[PDB]
Amino acid sequence: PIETVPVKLKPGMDGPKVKQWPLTEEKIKALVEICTEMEKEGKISKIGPENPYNTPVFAIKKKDSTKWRKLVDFRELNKRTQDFWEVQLGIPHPAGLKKKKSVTVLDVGDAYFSVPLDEDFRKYTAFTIPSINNETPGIRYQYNVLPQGWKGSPAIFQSSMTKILEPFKKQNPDIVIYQYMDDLYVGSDLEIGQHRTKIEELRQHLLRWGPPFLWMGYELHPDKWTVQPIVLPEKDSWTVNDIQKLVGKLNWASQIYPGIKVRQLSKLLRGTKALTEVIPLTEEAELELAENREILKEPVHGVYYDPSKDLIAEIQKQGQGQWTYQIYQEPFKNLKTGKYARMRGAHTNDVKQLTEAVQKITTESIVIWGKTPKFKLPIQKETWETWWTEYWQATWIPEWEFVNTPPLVKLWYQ
Amino acid sequence: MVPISPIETVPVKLKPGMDGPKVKQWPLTEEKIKALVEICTEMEKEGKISKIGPENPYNTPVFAIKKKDSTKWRKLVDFRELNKRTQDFWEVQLGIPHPAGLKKKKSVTVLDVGDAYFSVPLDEDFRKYTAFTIPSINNETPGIRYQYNVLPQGWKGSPAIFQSSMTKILEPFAAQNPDIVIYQYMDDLYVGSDLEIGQHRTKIEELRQHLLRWGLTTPDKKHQKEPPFLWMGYELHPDKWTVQPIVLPEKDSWTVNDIQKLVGKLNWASQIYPGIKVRQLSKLLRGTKALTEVIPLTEEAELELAENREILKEPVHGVYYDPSKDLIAEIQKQGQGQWTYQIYQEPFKNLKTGKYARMRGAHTNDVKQLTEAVQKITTESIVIWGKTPKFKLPIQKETWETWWTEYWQATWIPEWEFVNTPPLVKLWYQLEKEPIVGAETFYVDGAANRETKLGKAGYVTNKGRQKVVPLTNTTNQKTELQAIYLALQDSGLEVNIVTDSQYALGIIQAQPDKSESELVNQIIEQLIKKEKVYLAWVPAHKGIGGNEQVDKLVSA
C-alpha cells in the first residue's frame, strides 16, 4: 500500500481534544506492551508537544480470549471527520443480512495496519498512555496507518477489501458479506457445520491475502431473533386492580395503535371498589377486550426507517436479569423491540448486564440498518461512566444519554 | 572539545490565519535603555538572542524593572500579544502526583536544571516572531533589534517544550536504571532511590554523566533545603506527608472572600484531616459575586467552623503507599448530604482522607449518595494507586441487596463489606408489589385553578370514607401530592392508594428518603410509619370509578 488517501476534517472544525480517563495499572501495563510493539512495527510514532490533540484509549478483552486489545475511543474524531464517499456514492446496506440463518462476525481491523495514513491527518489520531498518579508524563503517540475504530479506515480500505473478497464472493453468490468499522459480518443459510468451515475458508483468504484476533468468530442467528408485540392478560377472574392495570396499558397502547377502546372495560370499574375485589367481565367488555387483542396482533402503521435520522434505543431494567428495549426514530413508532434474560457473567452485577445489553442491541442495529443507535440508559451517568469500560468487548462504541426519571411505561413491557 | 548531541528542535506554528505580533515599543528613560543594552549584550554573548536587520516586521515591547535590595535592573519582554497568536501545545503538567500514591525512597537528590533550560533551541522558522527593540538614546539612532534563539521566558510554548525536551533526554537513563525514580517540575529534577547513600550519590554522578552528553551542566540544588520539601502545598517528609500548616483565621466579620478562602483551606485540609465539613460554610456563598460582601454566619455555620477548628488543633499526617499491602476505603455518613472517608492499608494509618457532598436536587436518599461517594473514591483511587480499594460501608449487606434488586435503575458497588459504625444507611420504606387484601382502598385526587390558585385535595374509599380540603395558593402538582398525604394521614397501617398523578408517581418511584419540599417530606414521614402501602396508578379522565368520583369532588 503505497499512496495515502487525502483526508480532512469537516469545515471549520479542529481535531479532538478529549481527556484521557484514568486507567488501572493492569490496563496501562497492557497498553505499554502493545504500543511498544506497534511502535517497532511502524504503526504508531512518538509525538512532540507541538501536537495538542487527544483521543482516549483503554484496553479490553474480546469475548472468550485472554489477550488484551487496544481500544481507541474515536467517537469525537469520527464525528469531526469528513463524511466519506470512498469510491462510490455509497454501499447500500444489505437488507438480506438480517434474514440469513447464521451470521458470523470477524475482527478484520488488523488488515487496516497495512495502509498508510495521510501524513497531514496523523496528528489528529494522537493519544496518551497515562501514568499512575501523574508520576511521569503520559506516553504520547500518533498513528502512521489506518487505525482500528476510525470512521475513515473501512472507507479508505474498501477498495482493498472488495478485491480480497471477489474470489470468495464469485464462488459463493448466496453468502452475504457486510463490513462495519473493524468488523466483517458474513451470513449464510447453510448448516453451521459447513458455515464454520466456510468462515474458516474466508479467514485463510484474508490470511493468504495478508492478525491477533482474526481467529475468532462471533456467531449470530438473526433469523431466530424474536420481537415482542404487546400482550394482554388472559384471565378467568379479574380484580379491580387487574382491570385498572389493563386500562392503563391499553391507554398507553392507544398512542401506538388506532382504535383501542377502554370504555366498556372502564364501565366495570363503577363505584369505589376495593382493589382486590373480583369483577366479572360483562359481554360488552369482553368484546372490547377481544377487539383490542386483535388490533394488537397487527403491526404498527407507517413505520419506515428514515436513513437521515438517528436510531434511538431505550432500555428498561425489569429485574431478575431481564431487560426490555425498543428501537425507534420517532416516538411510538418502534422499528424493533426485544427482551433479554440471563446475561451470563453477572447475576449480581446490574451494570455488567446493561453493558452486555447495549452491545447486543448495537449488534442488532448494525445488522438491520448498518449503524449504531443512540442509547437512553436507565442508570446514573457517574455509575455508568465509572464501570462500563470494565465489561466492554466490542471494537465500536455507540453514543448514550441517561434517564434520571423513572418511566411509567416499564410496566407495560413487563 | 567533547562533541555534545544537539537537543531536537520542536517545530512551532502560529494559530492558523494569524500573523506574528506588531506591538509598538514604549519610550524608555535613558537609564533604562543603558541597562537593557548591557543585559542584552551579555545575553547575545551567551547565544540567547541575536541582532537582526530591519526587514523583520514583527515586534514585542521590552521593559526594564527594578527590585528591592538587589539594586539591579532586570529585563522583561512582554510576550502577551505573541502568546495569543501561538498555537496550542500539549501541556504535560496538568496534574501532580498525590503524596499518598508515592512510595518511600531512602535517599532523594534535587538537581538544578535552570541552566540546561537555555540549551533548548527555539525552532528557527519561528524566531522571527520573537523580535524586540531596544530604543536608542535620545531616539537619534536606529533601535537595536534582537530575536531569541532559545525558549523565551514568558512565551506560551516554553514550559511544554522544555519539559518535553528534558523527558526525552532522561528517557534512556530512567529505563536503564529501574532502581531509581526521576521527577521533574519547573527547574527542579528530583531523583530518589532505595540505594545506600554512597551508591545513590553515584547514580547521581552517572546522571550528570548522562546529562553532559547534551552539554547540560547540572550541580546539586544550591542551599539544599532540609526536609521536608515544600512542594505544591505539601510537606513531603521522609516517612510521612502533610499539607503545609493549616491556620484558620480568627474573625468577627466574615466576608465572601474569607469564606471562599476558608473552604479552600478546609478542602485542601480534608485530604488528610478526617471529618472536615463545609456544607453550611459553602452554603453561605450561594449566589454572591461581590467578594467584599459580608455575610452573617448561621449558627449551623459557626458550629461547623468550630468543629473544623477542633479537627485542626493537632496536625495529622498520612503514610506512603506499600503495593504489597491491601488498599481499603471506609466511608461514614455525616448528615445533611455530607460524607467522609479514609483510605488506608493498616488500621489507624491513613494514606489519605476525603469527603463527598450530595448533588443539588429536590429529592434524594442516603443509598444513592453512598453510591455516588463510592464512585468518586473509586475514580480517585484509580488515579492515585491504579486500582480500586476494598470498601467498608455502613450499610447492611441485606439492605443493599433489597435496594439494587428493586431499584428501577441499574446500579453497582464494587467489592465491599459491612462496617457497623452508626449511623447506618437503610431503606426507610418499601412499597408493596401487589394490592393488600383487607386494606382500605383510597382513591385520591387534587386540582387547582391556574388563575386564582385555589385548589382542592381529597379522597374517597371503598368503606365510604371521604375528605375534600380547600386549599389556597396552590397548583395542580401540589394538590396531587396533598391528596396522597391526606390518604396516608387518615388510613390505618396498611393502605391501598389509587392516584392518576404521573407527577407524584415519578417522585415516589424514585424512592426519596428526604426532600427540599416540605410536602414530599411529610409524605415520606407517613410512609415510614406505615406497615404496608400499595400505590397504584390509573390514567385520568377514563371513567375509572372512585377516581372519577374524587376528580369531580376536587375540580370545583
Ligand SMILES: Cc1cc(C#N)cc(C)c1Oc1nc(NC2CCN(Cc3ccc(S(N)(=O)=O)cc3)CC2)nc2ccsc12
Ligand atoms: C522525587 C520527588 C520529589 C518531590 C518533591 N519535593 C515530589 C515528587 C512527586 C517526586 O517524585 C517521586 N517521589 C516519590 N516518592 C517520595 C516519597 C517521600 N519523599 C520525601 C523525602 C524523602 C527523602 C528525603 S531525604 N532522607 O533524602 O532527606 C527527603 C524527603 C520524597 C520521595 N516516588 C516517585 C515515583 C515516581 S516519581 C516519584
Ligand SMILES: [Mg+2]
Ligand atoms: Mg383529576
